[PDB]
Ligand SMILES: O=C(O)c1ccc(-c2nn(C(=O)c3c(Cl)cccc3C(F)(F)F)c3ccccc23)cc1
């Protein structure tokens with residue numbers, strides 16, 4: 046009906062098509078937990094092997110978020126500089142939010158390579174403080190019990206942010222952001238879920254965690270670089286320079 050009800054539907058559809066893992070599958074698999082043996086198996090792998098596994102999973106996760114963006118109304122009519130600026134600042138913020146779906150707060154486990162495991166799975170990477178910050182962020186998001194439509198609309202707003210430094214057509218990003226803000230508010234009101242607004246992470250916290258993650262990924266990429274077929278080569282070239 047309204048341009049806004051369609052925008053809600055097209056964001057939720059984009060998300061459904063790019064969500065990478067199905068929520069019912071992730072909820073169904075929570076009982077499928079790595080044994081002590083499988084865990085010491087991961088812990089004994091080289092840093093460089095665990096880095097190769099985790100780098101490729103994270104790159105693929107980023108590629109689902111790039112596709113999500115490309116399918117948001119108006120994203121493809123932004124100039125290429127602004128597309129790169131938004132995804133560079135936002136795509137890994139969206140991956141970190143998407144993680145909460147694959148996270149079980151009851152035993153603090155994440156779905157990884159077909160089973161749930163704790164952060165000790167990743168010991169060989171020697172990243173314990175950063176990995177702990179990532180699990181704690183997922184742990185605090187788990188309390189919101191995001192619906193699929195909430196996660197879709199919230200992650201759209203994570204990407205479409207006119208405050209990112211470097212934008213060339215700030216007013217064009219503002220028009221998309223305000224339509225998505227109205228879509229999000231409208232949807233929460235229609236579903237009696239406005240209470241999540243007071244509980245969303247402070248913007249500073251997501252940007253800060255994302256900044257520490259990407260800096261650590263860039264250090265590993267520097268020491269032991271992986272390659273992938275770039276989904277968005279201009280963005281890829283600006284991360285893997
Ligand atoms: O397929 C692509 O076009 C593409 C695929 C991935 C990205 C992208 N990688 N990335 C990383 O942090 C990253 C990852 Cl996930 C794995 C290994 C090394 C890295 C690092 F070198 F960049 F640090 C990002 C952060 C923020 C935003 C986009 C990306 C960008 C583009």
Ligand SMILES: C[C@H](CCCC(C)(C)O)[C@H]1CC[C@H]2[C@@H]3CC=C4C[C@@H](O)CC[C@]4(C)[C@H]3CC[C@]12C
Nearest residue numbers: 065099102103106140143144147155167172179
């Ligand atoms: C927290 C750990 C370790 C990160 C290690 C470091 C800091 C070197 O990158 C990472 C490794 C792999 C990541 C998952 C990859 C894919 C997905 C699917 C996506 O839909 C949601 C996020 C998730 C589950 C990632 C979570 C973070 C993981 C476990």
